[PDB]
Amino acid sequence: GLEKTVKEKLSFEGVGIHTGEYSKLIIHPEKEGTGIRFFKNGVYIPARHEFVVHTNHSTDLGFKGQRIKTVEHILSVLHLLEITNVTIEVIGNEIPILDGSGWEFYEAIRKNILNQNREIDYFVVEEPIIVEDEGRLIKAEPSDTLEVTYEGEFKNFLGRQKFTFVEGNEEEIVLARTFAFDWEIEHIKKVGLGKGGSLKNTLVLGKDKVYNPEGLRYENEPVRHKVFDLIGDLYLLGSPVKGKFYSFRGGHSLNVKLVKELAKKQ
Amino acid sequence: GLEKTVKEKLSFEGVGIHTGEYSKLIIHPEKEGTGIRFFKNGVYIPARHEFVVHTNHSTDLGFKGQRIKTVEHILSVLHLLEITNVTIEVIGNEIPILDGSGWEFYEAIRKNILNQNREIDYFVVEEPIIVEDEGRLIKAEPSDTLEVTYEGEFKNFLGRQKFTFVEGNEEEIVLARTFAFDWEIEHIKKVGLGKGGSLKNTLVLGKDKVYNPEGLRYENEPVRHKVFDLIGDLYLLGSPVKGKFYSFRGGHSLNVKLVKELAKKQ
Ligand SMILES: CCCCCC/C=C/CCCCCCCC(=O)O
Ligand SMILES: CCCCCC/C=C/CCCCCCCC(=O)O
Ligand SMILES: [Cl-]
Ligand SMILES: [Cl-]
Ligand SMILES: [Cl-]
Numbered sequence: 001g002l003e004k005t006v007k008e009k010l011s012f013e014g015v016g017i018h019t020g021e022y023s024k025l026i027i028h029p030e031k032e033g034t035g036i037r038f039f040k041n042g043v044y045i046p047a048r049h050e051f052v053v054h055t056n057h058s059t060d061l062g063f064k065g066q067r068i069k070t071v072e073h074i075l076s077v078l079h080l081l082e083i084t085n086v087t088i089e090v091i092g093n094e095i096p097i098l099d100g101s102g103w104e105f106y107e108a109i110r111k112n113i114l115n116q117n118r119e120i121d122y123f124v125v126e127e128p129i130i131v132e133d134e135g136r137l138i139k140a141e142p143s144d145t146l147e148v149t150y151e152g153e154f155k156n157f158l159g160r161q162k163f164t165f166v167e168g169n170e171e172e173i174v175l176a177r178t179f180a181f182d183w184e185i186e187h188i189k190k191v192g193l194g195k196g197g198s199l200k201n202t203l204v205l206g207k208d209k210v211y212n213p214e215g216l217r218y219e220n221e222p223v224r225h226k227v228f229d230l231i232g233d234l235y236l237l238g239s240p241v242k243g244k245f246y247s248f249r250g251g252h253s254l255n256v257k258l259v260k261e262l263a264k265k266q
Numbered sequence: 267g268l269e270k271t272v273k274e275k276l277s278f279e280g281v282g283i284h285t286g287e288y289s290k291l292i293i294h295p296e297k298e299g300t301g302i303r304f305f306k307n308g309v310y311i312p313a314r315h316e317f318v319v320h321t322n323h324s325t326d327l328g329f330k331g332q333r334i335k336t337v338e339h340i341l342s343v344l345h346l347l348e349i350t351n352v353t354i355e356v357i358g359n360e361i362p363i364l365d366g367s368g369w370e371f372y373e374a375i376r377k378n379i380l381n382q383n384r385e386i387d388y389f390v391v392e393e394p395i396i397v398e399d400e401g402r403l404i405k406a407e408p409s410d411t412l413e414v415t416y417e418g419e420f421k422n423f424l425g426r427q428k429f430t431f432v433e434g435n436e437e438e439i440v441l442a443r444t445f446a447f448d449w450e451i452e453h454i455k456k457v458g459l460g461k462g463g464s465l466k467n468t469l470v471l472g473k474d475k476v477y478n479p480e481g482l483r484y485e486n487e488p489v490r491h492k493v494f495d496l497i498g499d500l501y502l503l504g505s506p507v508k509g510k511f512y513s514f515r516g517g518h519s520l521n522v523k524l525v526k527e528l529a530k531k532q
């Protein structure tokens with residue numbers, strides 16, 4: 001694959017699911033070898049694991065006193081389309097959540113791709129690895145293609161189920177929205193988070209009922225979104241990834257723990 | 267008491283808890299003997315029981331093809347302050363829910379009262395009456411003052427409790443917000459309602475947890491709000507009421523059923 005960027009600036013705006021504040025993005029084109037980086041109040045924050053400053057309920061980055069919340073969805077989309085050189089200008093403290101999935105981001109970036117002059121230097125998983133924690137587990141092994149599987153064991157009706165993404169099936173996960181169980185909402189709100197949450201950007205799941213009037217887009221939309229998240233967190237490795245991943249009940253924290261292991265080893 | 271109206275137009279705007287649409291109110295002053303009436307698309311809708319067209323999840327009025335949803339909170343405030351002559355102009359299909367209580371309405375109307383030249387012709391409960399339905403019950407008897415008691419028997423932690431409003435204690439109920447149990451939200455949304463609902467205008471109560479980060483304003487804020495509602499529904503009798511009411515698990519439907527009984531009898 002050839003490094004890619006955008007043919008022109010693309011902007012998005014809306015509220016942040018956590019801050020509740022309005023915010024706007026502006027993806028700028030960049031030359032070969034630049035990499036993915038955010039820009040806020042004059043500071044460049046590389047979309048790399050060394051800048052992760054928070055992983056509960058979202059993956060946040062920060063540098064030199066400047067922070068940006070929830071970068072997983074836009075990074076996931078960038079990872080899927082293989083965009084490698086862009087500066088994500090952020091006016092606000094968080095990435096707009098939009099509808100909760102990566103659809104809008106995907107559709108716009110997909111038709112504004114600009115191939116550049118250089119082969120992509122993929123981060124390739126060279127040997128097997130496993131990272132565990134409180135029953136949660138993520139496994140990674142060598143592969144010529146990006147393959148991600150997420151298995152969930154839910155306390156509500158979703159019960160136990162898994163989903164697998166393989167290159168070419170981008171559209172099966174870019175629509176999967178963000179979700180939360182009703183029993184977690186009180187916590188999110190108490191710790192100063194989820195201020196921008198609503199049924200318009202979050203699928204609220206009860207012990208055996210879906211609150212959202214629109215129901216689920218897929219009987220397993222939740223685990224599909226989990227794959228979407230993992231794929232975004234993986235891009236923090238610094239470049240498009242080539243490996244086979246299996247995540248059992250993983251989350252941003254474990255995802256990042258894995259990312260750091262991989263980087264460290266190589 | 268002397269009939270009252272406002273010293274000048276007072277307007278309020280916001281979203282409707284049910285429609286989700288924006289809407290604005292404009293309370294206009296009116297001469298003696300006018301009464302409380304709404305105005306929409308050229309049609310005057312008297313704030314009277316004969317115009318009630320819906321009572322599930324809200325008290326709605328309608329006439330000659332024009333409808334206005336959720337009139338209980340503004341009417342309650344009008345009933346408490348004893349405003350008797352005004353035209354509530356409605357731009358939209360529902361009364362703005364605002365924060366879910368009658369605070370904003372109360373504060374504005376309270377300092378713009380204009381006493382007029384005529385004694386109020388109070389609707390006076392002349393004999394005892396009881397209206398029942400599926401265990402729910404409302405009782406009314408003679409009284410020189412408006413006295414309203416609401417007793418609830420909740421399936422969640424609130425358990426069993428009651429509250430009593432007596433003239434002079436207006437402020438103890440004008441702040442009590444709208445509430446709903448998480449287990450009802452799916453229904454509201456399915457029947458095309460609660461489209462404007464959020465934790466910003468509704469207290470969502472779980473089986474033993476309060477979702478709202480701000481918690482309850484009173485350990486019994488729910489039953490206080492029920493009294494607030496009943497007082498608004500009673501004003502549909504056509505004029506300030508003087509009677510002693512006791513409501514056991516009552517709701518808009520029973521409230522109106524009572525209102526109609528009373529009117530019919532007298
Ligand atoms: C005001 C009414 C209601 C609905 C409130 C929804 C609660 C907010 C939940 C926050 C979701 C956090 C998970 C998002 C992270 C991700 O998708 O990677
Ligand atoms: C779990 C997340 C969600 C919050 C969504 C809030 C839904 C609002 C429900 C509609 C309330 C109806 C009762 C209002 C009538 C009244 O107070 O008289
Ligand atoms: Cl947490
Ligand atoms: Cl948004
Ligand atoms: Cl209100």
Ligand SMILES: [Zn+2]
Nearest residue numbers: 056057187191
């Ligand atoms: Zn937390």
Ligand SMILES: [Zn+2]
Nearest residue numbers: 072178225229
């Ligand atoms: Zn997500």
Ligand SMILES: [Zn+2]
Nearest residue numbers: 275292294355
């Ligand atoms: Zn007007």
Ligand SMILES: [Zn+2]
Nearest residue numbers: 322323453457
């Ligand atoms: Zn109903």
Ligand SMILES: [Zn+2]
Nearest residue numbers: 338444491495
């Ligand atoms: Zn109410």
